[PDB]
Amino acid sequence: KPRKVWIIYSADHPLYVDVVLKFAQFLLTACGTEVALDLLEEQAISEAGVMTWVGRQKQEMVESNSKIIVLCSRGTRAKWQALLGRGAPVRLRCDDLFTAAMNMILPDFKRPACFGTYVVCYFSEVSCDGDVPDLFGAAPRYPLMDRFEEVYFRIQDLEDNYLRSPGGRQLRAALDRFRDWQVRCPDWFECENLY
């Protein structure tokens, strides 16, 4: 049985969604890791609840000793602030499973035994440390891809080089493309936010 993983993220813009999908594919084609990703299960999410689906993903990871990757970004920051009632609610065009997933995993962060399940990341090219919700507090943060090595170790239970691995250049092209856009359109996030 290959390593399985659940990716949690905020769908901030079609370009960042593509970054996320390319990462998922990199994990599969470069690391032989199976990924639970909401993009890939729209039907299941449709029929079962969104809460039912999120609850089902977490359950499968924890009981199989598999990791939950938290991908942090501009949207995870804003959605967390909203959850805290210290920022307006967010209504993103691409949406909200990140908020649902945050509700689901929340209690785990008063449980030290549960921290090793979570792998807290953000892509340094398009996102920043300040994007990580303080819910994760003292959990290690991995700037990707600078520190993907460490994330790999955790996914594998152990103890720009990825560009030559299958799917690495595609992920990097996706990163570059979103980055250039944030430069071209600095208010990209605010444009994604409806009402």
Swiss-Prot record:
PTM section of the record: Glycosylated.
Tissue expression as described in the entry: Widely expressed.
Domain of life the protein comes from: Eukaryota
Every SEFIR domain range: 2-153
Function: Receptor for IL17A and IL17F, major effector cytokines of innate and adaptive immune system involved in antimicrobial host defense and maintenance of tissue integrity. Receptor for IL17A. Receptor for IL17F. Binds to IL17A with higher affinity than to IL17F. Binds IL17A and IL17F homodimers as part of a heterodimeric complex with IL17RC. Also binds heterodimers formed by IL17A and IL17F as part of a heterodimeric complex with IL17RC.
Subunit comment: Forms heterodimers with IL17RC; the heterodimer binds IL17A and IL17F homodimers as well as the heterodimer formed by IL17A and IL17F. Forms complexes with 2:1 binding stoichiometry: two receptor chains for one interleukin molecule. IL17A homodimer preferentially drives the formation of IL17RA-IL17RC heterodimeric receptor complex, whereas IL17F homodimer forms predominantly complexes with IL17RC homodimer.
Involvement in disorder: Immunodeficiency 51: A primary immunodeficiency disorder with altered immune responses and impaired clearance of fungal infections, selective against Candida. It is characterized by persistent and/or recurrent infections of the skin, nails and mucous membranes caused by organisms of the genus Candida, mainly Candida albicans.
Name listed for the protein in its UniProt record: Interleukin-17 receptor A
Species assigned in the record: Homo sapiens (Human)
Gene giving rise to this polypeptide: IL17RA
